[PDB]
Design a protein around this nucleic acid. Structure first.
Ligand SMILES: [Mn+2]
Ligand SMILES: [Mn+2]
Length: 445
DNA sequence: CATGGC
DNA sequence: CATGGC
């Protein structure tokens, strides 16, 4: 990684260690996903390795009315993880010392003399491929503690930074943890929750990489194992190399991407590999159980874990319901577009996820872009998703959704492979035709 | 009113 | 997925 980001991380490692000398308690503010949670856990474990104290708040968004609330708190150091860049002037106003470890699209109005931004964008690194908020926090706290490098990668996983290998600083952090002896890389089958589920559920719940026929299908995987010589109820670590060699051979036919890198730290032995941990933190976040999530990053392991594993389990049962619905009621196709639609509240928060899983499983044609639609009374939340072939071929959902949404006083955007929009329900039909007419110009002439 | 989710 | 509107 470029020297500047290790310099700037060291600049922020100074500000911390000197407040911990004085006995100051540190304020941590972070985001509520796996990257946010794992980021907070990083700073918290650096802080506990030096007998410091801290006060964590976990929020979904950062609002101005919270940074104003923050300024009468009388804390000497504010450590923002996975949020800040957007609201830099308002955090510059804040008294005392400040650290923003974020990886979002920063403010060119780049404020703060008391403030220490770390953000991989400002060191010509990629903010959605090469380093995560949890990763950036480890750069901020490398000099104090190096045992936290696993959590750094957990955030990177949850936040989808893995194409054929961790790029950039994540690779660097991955390298570094291996040398430290806290992380182990291995090539193995990438099955969901191996230590903790029987083989057939583990194959059923492997949503990424998708397993056509098997993913989200207990009876089929159960079937699949039975008729290939393998005990559907035994745990994956309890197989023998020749039956391991059989499942590997067959699962590789169904999708070769299932064999590849798997990361394990001795702190998470019994729970999961770093992907499974990410999953668990995401489930805690999505149930507003932030103390359970943080608990886990700090080693807490009794009933908290069992609660956390059950949140994962429940969420996975949603996604099967989920892909089972998709499936019963297919997508209605049109010109350069698919779309599916629900008024069921059960699917409002899951729609994008099942949308893109359903393309990986080939249920719905991966070449045609897919618009998940969820009715929120007078508005319709839109989750757009397509394949890598569909982009390298014109399709850009990032712009198209912004164009068409703003047309009807609504609001959309993103990338590229994946966009979101909020649109009036009265307009939905004309909106769906306008995206279709916009994609047609994006691929045709 | 206030906050806190997506 | 852009939020910052609901
Ligand atoms: Mn993040
Ligand atoms: Mn985040």
């Amino acid at each position: 990684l470029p020297d500047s980001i290790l310099k700037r991380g060291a600049e922020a490692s100074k500000v911390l260690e000197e407040h911990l000398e004085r006995g100051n308690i540190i304020r941590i503010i972070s985001h509520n996903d796996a990257d946010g949670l794992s980021a907070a856990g990083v700073v918290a474990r650096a802080i506990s390795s030096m007998n410091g104290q801290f006060h964590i708040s976990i929020l979904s968004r950062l609002k101005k009315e919270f940074i104003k609330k923050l300024s009468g708190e009388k804390y000497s150091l504010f450590f923002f993880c996975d949020m800040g860049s957007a609201y830099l002037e308002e955090i510059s106003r804040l008294k005392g010392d400040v650290i923003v470890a974020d990886h979002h699209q920063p403010s060119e109005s780049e404020a703060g003399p008391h403030v220490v931004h770390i953000n991989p964008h400002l060191h010509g690194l990629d903010g959605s491929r090469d380093l995560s908020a949890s990763g950036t926090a480890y750069l901020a706290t490398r000099l104090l503690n190096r045992k936290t490098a696993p959590l750094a990668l957990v955030g990177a996983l949850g936040d989808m930074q893995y194409t054929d290998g961790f790029t950039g600083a994540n690779r660097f952090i991955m390298e570094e943890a291996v040398e430290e002896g806290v992380l182990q890389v291995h090539s193995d089958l990438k099955l969901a929750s191996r230590y903790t589920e029987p083989l057939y559920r583990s194959i059923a719940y492997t949503f990424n990489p998708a397993l056509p026929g098997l993913t989200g299908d207990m009876e089929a995987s159960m079937g699949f194992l039975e008729n290939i010589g393998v005990s559907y109820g035994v745990k994956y670590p309890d197989l023998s190399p020749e039956e391991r060699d059989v499942l590997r051979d067959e699962l590789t036919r169904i999708n070769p991407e299932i064999f590849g890198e798997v990361f394990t730290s001795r702190e998470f032995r019994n729970i999961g590999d770093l992907s499974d941990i990410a999953g668990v933190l995401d489930a805690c976040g999505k149930n507003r159980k932030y103390g359970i999530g943080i608990g886990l990053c700090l080693g807490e392991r009794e009933g908290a874990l069992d609660v956390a594993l059950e949140l994962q389990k429940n969420y996975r049962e949603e996604l099967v319901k989920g892909l089972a619905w998709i499936r019963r009621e297919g997508s209605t196709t049109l010109e350069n577009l698919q779309y599916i639609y629900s008024e069921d509240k059960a699917f409002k928060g899951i729609m994008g996820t099942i949308a893109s899983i359903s393309l990986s499983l080939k249920i719905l044609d991966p070449d045609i872009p897919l618009l998940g639609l969820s009715r929120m009374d007078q508005h319709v939340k839109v989750s757009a998703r397509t394949t890598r072939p569909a982009v390298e071929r014109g399709v850009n959902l990032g712009v198209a959704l912004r164009d068409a949404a703003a047309s009807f006083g609504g609001t959309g955007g993103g990338h590229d492979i994946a966009a979101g929009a909020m649109v009036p329900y009265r307009d939905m039909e004309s909106f769906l035709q306008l995206v279709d007419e916009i994609l047609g110009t994006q691929t045709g002439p």
